[PDB]
Amino acid sequence: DVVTEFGALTDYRKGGVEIIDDDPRNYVFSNVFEVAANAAPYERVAVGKNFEYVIESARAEGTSGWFSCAHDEFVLAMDGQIEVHLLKLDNSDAYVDPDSEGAVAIGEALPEGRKMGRIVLRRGHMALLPVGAAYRFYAEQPAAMLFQSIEGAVTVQKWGEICQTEA
Amino acid sequence: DVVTEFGALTDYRKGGVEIIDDDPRNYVFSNVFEVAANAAPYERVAVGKNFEYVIESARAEGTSGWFSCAHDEFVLAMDGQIEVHLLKLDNSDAYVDPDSEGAVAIGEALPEGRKMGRIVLRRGHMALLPVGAAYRFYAEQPAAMLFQSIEGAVTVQKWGE
Amino acid sequence: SKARTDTEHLAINNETGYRSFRAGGFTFTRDEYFARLTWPGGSHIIPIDAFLRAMMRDVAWGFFYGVVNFDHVFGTINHYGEVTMFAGRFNDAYRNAGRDHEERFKSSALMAVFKDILSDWTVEGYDPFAAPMETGLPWGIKNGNNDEAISRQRVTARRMVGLPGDTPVRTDANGFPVNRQFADVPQEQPVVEAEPGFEAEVSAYNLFGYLSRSDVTWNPSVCSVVGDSLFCPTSEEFILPVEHGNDRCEWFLQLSDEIVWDVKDKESGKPRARVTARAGDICCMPADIRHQGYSTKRSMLLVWENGSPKIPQMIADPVVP
Amino acid sequence: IDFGDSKARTDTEHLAINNETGYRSFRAGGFTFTRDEYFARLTWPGGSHIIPIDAFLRAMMRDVAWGFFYGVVNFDHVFGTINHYGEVTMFAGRFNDAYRNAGRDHEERFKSSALMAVFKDILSDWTVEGYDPFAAPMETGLPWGIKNGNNDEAISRQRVTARRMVGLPGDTPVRTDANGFPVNRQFADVPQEQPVVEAEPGFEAEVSAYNLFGYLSRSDVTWNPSVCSVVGDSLFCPTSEEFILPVEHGNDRCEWFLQLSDEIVWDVKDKESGKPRARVTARAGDICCMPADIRHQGYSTKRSMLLVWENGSPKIPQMIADGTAPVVPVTF
Ligand SMILES: Cc1cc(O)ccc1O
Ligand SMILES: Cc1cc(O)ccc1O
Ligand SMILES: [Fe+3]
Ligand SMILES: [Fe+3]
C-alpha cells in the first residue's frame, strides 16, 4: 500500500552530501524542519538564498506580531495547522518603506485597516501574502512553515549553524 | 437635449490659462488632439510628466511597428477606431531589457511568440498592454490615442513646440 | 509630540436634533443652516451644505493627498497615518497674527469622528456626494439620515477595471445606470477577442461609459495602475467642494465638456490663475498652488496622480516639472 | 545584403521517410537526426553518436516542454543544448574533456524558434502509439520498433505557469478530477482537502490559498518544474519526480531543491568536464543548492514531490561568467 513520506517538526530524517571530489559546503544543505525546531517562534531563518531572494523557515507557535511587505510573499505550511489573518492597511506606507524589500515586523499592536479575511493552512497548503496587507499567524500546536520572499529586516542568516559542513 | 462634448483630431477647442499673478508655463498646458495632429504617425509625444511617469499622445495611422515593455502600460483611444494586436513573446528578454522602462520599438517584423488576441477600440475605450506581450496597432483612418507609461526609448519630448 | 486620539460625542441639542462633537481642542456643532466650529482662541462658520459636501470628500478620500481646505480657514493636512486639522494655517491674516491653530491626530481617530459627524448631520433625502440638481436639501432640524449615501464603498482598480478579480465594469444590472447628463454617451463594449489561454490578459473596457455611470461627483477613482502612476478619472458637476493643495504635482486631462479651475497660492490663499480646460486639454497643477474646479454640465475628468510617498519630502528641497 | 541575416542559423529540413522503419529523418544545420527500432542516430560534420531511443525521447520531451530551459540541457555525456534565450546552441562533445582536448567537439548556434520547430517535428514523428515520453517507465508503454501511430496528445501538453499564484482569479487553476487531473497512483494516500479560506466582502480576489501537495499529487507528468508562485524573479517550480531526470542539467545560475516528500538522490558532476563530484541524498524537508559550476541528474524510486526554486533574472549568466556573481550563493 502506497505511503507518501512527509516530514514534521518532530519526525524528519535528514540526508546529506556524499563526497567524491567536492566540498559539502558548496551545497548549503539543511533541513527546514530542524531549522524551524531550533529557532524562536516566528523567527524567519533563511534556508535558501539566490541574490536578494530567500526561502525562510519558521516555527509557528502561539500568536505572532503583524508583518507587512513592499512586495508579494507566499507562505507554505509544512506541518501542523496555521491560521493566517489578513488586514488591508489604511496607510501601508506608514508601516513599510515602499523602497524596502523583505517582510517588516510592524508590531503586536493592531494596525489601522480593514479585515480582509482568514485562512487556515494545513501541511502542504500555500497562501498568498499580498502587498498592501498586514498579516499575522496563530498556531495552537507547534507548526513548520516556509516563506517565499526577499532578504530584509526580518530574515535571520546562520548558514554555519544550519548547514552540513563535513562528510 | 443632452450633448456630451468630446474632442477629435478634426474638432477640438483648446482652453487656456488666464493669469492673475503667475507664469503660464507652470501649468504646461496643451491639447492632446492638437499634439497628435502635429506628430508623425505613431510618434509618442509626452504631454504629461511626473518624475519618470508619462502620458503620451499619438496619432495612429496605418500599421505601427511592434512594441514591448518591461512593465504594464495602458492605451486609451480618444477618437477613431484603433486595433490592438497582441503577441505573447517566447523570450521577452530577447527584445526588452527587463530593467528598462517605457515602451521599446522592436520592429515591423513579427516577433517570435504566440498569438494572444485582438482588441478593437473606439473613442473612450482603454486596453491593457500587459508586460510580456508585444503589441502593435492598426488604424484605417487617422485616430488619436493616449498612453499611460514611463519615459523611455520611444518617448518624444517636445516641450517647446 | 505624539499625535492626538482624544475625540468625544457631545450632547444632542433639543431644538435642532443634531449631536455636537469634539476632536482634540476643536468642537463641531450644526444648526438649521450652519456648521459652527470652535478651537482654542477662535470660531468659524461654514454653510452646512458646503461643509457636508467638503466632509463627504475628506471622509471618502481618507484625507487624500496633502491639504484639503474646506475653505479659506478650516481643513486637514494628510501625513499618511497622521493628519493635521487646522484653522487659518494657510491664511495670511491668521498666520501673520499668530492666530492659526493646528492639532495633529492619529488618522483613524480623526476619521472615526468625521464619519460620526457626517452621519449625524446628513438628513434623509440629502446626498452630499451628488450635484445640487440631483438631490434634496440639508437645511433645518435633524430629520432621518442618509447613511447609504455617505457609506458608499470606494472602488479602486488594482491593475485595470474589468480584469478578473479586479474592480468590475458598471452596468444597469450591477446598479450603475447612465447619469442623466451623459444620456447621449455611447455604451458599446470594445471588441475583445482572446486566443484560448490568454483570456485574463486580453482586456479592454469602455472608460467613457464607466464614467458616464459614476453615481457621485468629484471623486477621483483609480481605473488603471502603472507602478505609482494612477489614472483616477471621475464625473464632475457644480463645484469641487474643497480647495485641494497637493503635496506633489498632479495633472488634469479633460475628457469631455469643460471645467474652469480657480488656482490660488497654496500657502496664502491668494488668487494666481484661472485655467479653462475643454475636451482634450491637459495641464499640470503645481505643488505650490491649491485649486478648485467649476463644471456646469456633468463632465468627464481624468485626474492623473503619482502616488509615490517619496515625492513630498523631495519637494521640500522642484515644485514644477 | 539581407537585414534578415543573423549569425544564428535557421536552416532546418524534413528529410526522407525510411520505408523499412517508417520514420522520417530531420536536419538542423550540420546535424542530422535519424531513428531506428532502438536508437536515435546523430551525425554532425566530423562525427556521430547513438542514444537509446527511450532515453533520447525522454530528454527531447523535456527540452521541448521547457523551451530549452536554463543554461545547459545535456541529453547525455555528448549531446545537448545551451539556452541563450532567443537563441540556442546545439552541441556534440562541448562539455566532454575527451572531445574538447582533442578539438573534436562541434557546436552550432540557432534561432530558438527554428530549432524548436524541428525538435517538435522529431518528437512527434518518433513517438509511437501508447508511449508517453513525459511519464515514468511503469506508467507507459515502449518506444521500440517501427513507426506505429503516434502520441501527439502526450507530447503536446500545454505548459502550466502561474502568473502570481495557482488558483487566483484569472491565473492557472487548481487541478481536480473534473478538469482532467486525478491523483497519481503513487500519491493515492495524499490528503486532498483545500485550506479554509474566508474573505470579507470585497476582498475575495486577494484572500487566496490552495493545497499545493494536492496539486502536485495530480501532476500528470514527471520531471517538469512548473511555476506555482512568483515574487519578482523568484519562481517556485515544484514537480512530481519518478525514475531518472532525463537530462543532466548544467544551469547557468545557482538553483535550489527543496524535497517535499519521499527521497531523491542527485548525481552531481562537473558542469564543464562531466567528472563525478558528489551524490546528494534529500529526504522530506531537505533543502540544498546546486552550484552554477555543476550539472545534476536526479533519481527518485517512488514518485516524489520536489520544489525547484529558480531566480529567472537574465542578468545572472553574464555575472557568473565574469565572476561578479558567485558560483555558490552563500559561504560560511
Ligand atoms: C480633490 C480633487 C477631486 C476631483 O474630483 C478633481 C480634482 C481634485 O483635485
Ligand atoms: C531540469 C530539472 C527538472 C526537474 O524536474 C528537477 C530538477 C531539474 O534541474
Ligand atoms: Fe487636486
Ligand atoms: Fe536543474
Q: Are A31 and A10 a contacting pair, CB within 8 Å?
A: no
Q: Shortest Cα distance from A97 to chain C (angstroms)? A: 9
Q: Are D145 and D64 contained in the same domain?
A: yes
Q: Reduced to 3 states, what is the DSSP secondary structure of residue C58?
A: helix
Pick left, alpha or beta for residue C93 (phi over 0 → left; psi -120 to 50 → alpha; otherwise beta).
Answer: alpha
Sign of the CA dihedral with D123 first, then D128, D130, and D135 last: negative
Flag whether C51 is in a domain.
yes
Q: Name the A residues in 105-164 with CB < 8 Å from any D CB.
A: 114-128, 130, 133, 144, 146, 148-150, 159-160, 163
CA distance B17 to C273: 7
Q: Is residue A53 within 8 Å of D232, Cβ to Cβ?
A: yes
Binding residues of D for Fe(3+): 249, 255, 296
B157, B97 contact by CB (below 8 A): no
CATH number at residue D246: 2.60.120.10
For A81, residues 6+ apart whose C-beta sits below 8 A from its C-beta are: A120, A121, A122, A139, A140, A141, A143
Distances D271 to C71, D73, D97, D226, D285 between C-alpha atoms, Å: 72, 11, 11, 24, 26
Instruction: Tell me, yes or no, whether C171 lies in a domain.
Output: no
Output the 3-class SS for chain D.
Answer: CCCCCCCCECCEEEEEECCCCCCEEEEECCEEEEECCCEEEEEECCEEEEEEHHHHHHHHHHHHHCCCCCCEEECCCCEEEEECCCEEEEEECCCCHHHHHHCCCEEEEEEHHHHHHHHHHHHHHHCCCCCCCCCCHHHCCCCCCCCCCCCHHHHCCCCCCCCCECCCCCCCCCCCCCCCCCCCHHHCCCCCCCCEEEECCCCCCCCCEEEHHHHHHCCCCCCCCCCCEEECCEEEEEEEEEEECCCEEECCCCEEEEECCCEEEEEEEECCCCCEEEEEEEECCEEEEECCCEEEEEEEEEEEEEEEEEECCCCHHHHHHHCCCCCCCCCC
Does one domain contain both C143 and C185?
no
d(CA D210, CA D172): 12
Cα dist. C124→C48, C135, D72 in Å? Answer: 15, 10, 72
Quick one: D251 and D300 in the same domain? yes
For residues C17 and C127, membership in a common domain is answered with: yes
Q: Which residues surround ligand 4, an ion (CB under 5 A)?
A: D 249
Q: Where are the alpha helices (DSSP H) in chain C?
A: 48-60, 92-96, 107-121, 147-150, 207-212, 311-315
- Residues D38 and D144 grouped into a single domain: yes
Exposure letters A43-59 (e unless 16+ CB within 10 A, then b):
bbbbbbbbbbbbbbbbb
If you measure CA to CA, which chain D residue comes closest to C163? Answer: D170
Q: Is C249 in the pocket of ligand 1 (CB under 6 A)?
A: no
Q: Is residue D273 in some structural domain?
A: yes
Instruction: Map residue C280 onto helix, strand or coil.
Output: coil
Q: Are residues C227 and C119 in the same domain?
A: no
Same domain, C98 and C30: yes
Cell of D51: 542514444
Q: Beta-carbon neighbour count of residue C89 at 10 Å? A: 20
Helix (H, G, I), strand (E, B) or coil at A40: coil
Domain tally for chain C?
2
Q: Is C220 in the pocket of ligand 1 (CB under 6 A)?
A: yes
Q: Is B10 exposed, middle or buried (0-12, 13-18, 19+ CB in 10 A)?
A: exposed
Answer whether C227 touches B (CB < 8 Å): yes
Using DSSP, state whether A128 is helix, strand or coil. strand
> For residue D312, how far is its CA from the centre of ligand 2 (angstroms)?
14
Resolution value, angstrom units = 1.9
Is D167 inside a domain boundary? no
Domain assignment present for residue D213? The answer is: yes
C9 marked among binding-site residues:
no
Q: After which residues does chain C show a gap where C to N exceeds 2.5 Å?
A: 317
Q: Whose CA is nearest to atom 6 of ligand 2?
A: D223
C-alpha cell of residue D289:
543548492
* Nearest-CB residue to C164 (from D158, D169, D206): D169
Distance (Å, whole) CA D318 – CA D297: 24
Do the chains contact at D205 and C166, CB–CB below 8 Å?
Answer: yes
> Domain boundaries in chain B?
1-161
CA distance C37 to C55: 13
Cα atoms in the Cβ-side hemisphere of radius 13 Å centred on C54: 21
> SS3 of A124, please?
coil
Identify residue B147 by its one-letter amino acid code: F
Phi-psi region of C140 (alpha: psi -120 to 50; beta: other; left: phi over 0): left
Atom 4, ligand 1: residue with shortest CA distance? C218
Residue D251's domain comprises 185-220+222-322
Contact criterion met (CB below 8 Å) for C122 and C146: yes
Cell numbers describing residue C278: 475643454
* Contacts of residue C290, Cβ cutoff 8 Å, sequence gap at least 6: C67, C69, C90, C243, C244, C245, C263, C264, C265, C266, C269
Distance CA C194, CA C200 (A): 9
Regarding whether D124 and D71 lie in a shared domain, the answer is yes
Q: How far apart are CA C288 and CA C267, in angstroms?
A: 8
**Pocket-forming residues, ligand 2, beta carbon under 6 Å:** D 69, 223-225, 239, 241, 245, 249, 298, 308
Distance CA D83, CA D85 (A): 6
Report d(CA B87, CA B108) in Å as an integer: 13
Exposure string (b/e) for A62-75, b if CB count within 10 Å is 16 or more?
Answer: eebebbbbbbbbbb
Residues D135 and D198 in one domain: no
Instruction: Kindly report the number of other CB atoms within 10 A of residue D46's CB atom.
Output: 10
Domain C-terminal end among C128, C150, C172: C150
Which amino acid is located at C229 in the chain? S
Encoded amino acid at D32, one letter? T
DSSP code string of C205-220: EEHHHHHHT-SSSS--
Residue D314 · residue B98 · CB < 8 Å = yes
Q: How many Cβ atoms sit within 10 Å of the Cβ of residue B102?
A: 23
In this structure, the answer to whether residues D242 and D304 fall within a common structural domain is: yes
Instruction: Tell me how far CA of residue D111 lies from CA of B65, B108, C5, D10, D316, in angstroms.
Output: 21, 18, 66, 6, 21
Same domain, D193 and D140: no
